[PDB]
Write an enzyme that holds these catalytic residues in place. Structure first.
Site, PDB file in Angstrom:
ATOM      1  N   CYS A   1       6.258   2.704   6.884  1.00  0.00           N
ATOM      2  CA  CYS A   1       6.068   1.320   6.036  1.00  0.00           C
ATOM      3  C   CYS A   1       6.942   1.104   4.990  1.00  0.00           C
ATOM      4  CB  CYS A   1       4.441   1.330   5.570  1.00  0.00           C
ATOM      5  SG  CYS A   1       3.417   0.788   6.905  1.00  0.00           S
TER       6      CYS A   1
ATOM      7  N   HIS B   1       1.050  -1.082   0.227  1.00  0.00           N
ATOM      8  CA  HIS B   1      -0.050   0.043   0.085  1.00  0.00           C
ATOM      9  C   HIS B   1       0.724   1.281  -0.289  1.00  0.00           C
ATOM     10  CE1 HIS B   1       0.605  -0.166   4.201  1.00  0.00           C
ATOM     11  NE2 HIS B   1       0.463   1.157   4.511  1.00  0.00           N
TER      12      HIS B   1
ATOM     13  N   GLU C   1       0.063  -7.883   0.925  1.00  0.00           N
ATOM     14  CA  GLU C   1       0.540  -6.610   1.547  1.00  0.00           C
ATOM     15  C   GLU C   1       2.178  -6.780   1.164  1.00  0.00           C
ATOM     16  OE1 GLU C   1      -1.740  -3.941   1.232  1.00  0.00           O
ATOM     17  OE2 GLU C   1      -0.197  -3.337   2.234  1.00  0.00           O
TER      18      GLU C   1
END
Length: 166
Positions: free
Chosen positions: A132, A31, A55
């Site tokens: 992230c 993402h 992911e």
């Protein structure tokens, strides 16, 4: 202690980070991947093999993008109970290796996303929404190994989740 070359594999990408496993392989968290672009790192997408699941995103390029690097082992998840380091870079440039005791691999739904992930307990500094794609790594004998990319953390921050390869 992570040496400079290893940190040099952590790369600003999209809304977070990603990590050069080898001259040709780059991993990140799905993402954070920027939407609506035709090229990553100046190479067009027709030139890149892209594997995405849960992911965990992997790019394999057709040329050596980082020829200064050796290839490292990428594991399918971190060994349960291993203390990994999360190689966090901040936008300021600060390097923030966070020690994490890794737990069980598990499927998880996080704000609607299917995460094939591994929980960990942080061992006061936590992760933030910009982190992230930061890699989870540990040293096995003489060599560093990577086993996940940062994907989520709980409200308190005491528990983190990296996405891991299927």
């Amino acid at each position: 202690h992570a040496p400079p070359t290893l940190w040099s594999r952590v790369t600003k990408f999209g809304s977070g980070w990603g990590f050069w496993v080898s001259p040709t392989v780059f991993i990140t968290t799905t993402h954070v991947v920027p939407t609506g672009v035709k090229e990553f790192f100046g190479e067009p997408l027709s030139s890149i093999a892209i594997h995405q699941a849960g992911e965990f995103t992997q790019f394999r390029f057709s040329k050596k993008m980082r020829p200064d690097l050796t290839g490292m082992v990428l594991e399918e998840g971190c060994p349960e109970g291993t203390v990994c380091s999360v190689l966090i870079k901040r936008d300021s440039g600060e390097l923030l290796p966070l020690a994490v005791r890794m737990g069980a691999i598990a499927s998880m739904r996080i704000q609607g996303r299917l995460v094939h992930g591994q929980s960990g307990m942080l061992l006061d500094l936590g992760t933030i929404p910009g982190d992230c794609g930061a890699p989870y790594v540990h040293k096995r004998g003489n060599d560093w190994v990577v086993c996940g990319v940062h994907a989520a953390a709980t409200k308190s921050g005491n528990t983190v989740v990296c996405a891991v390869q299927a």
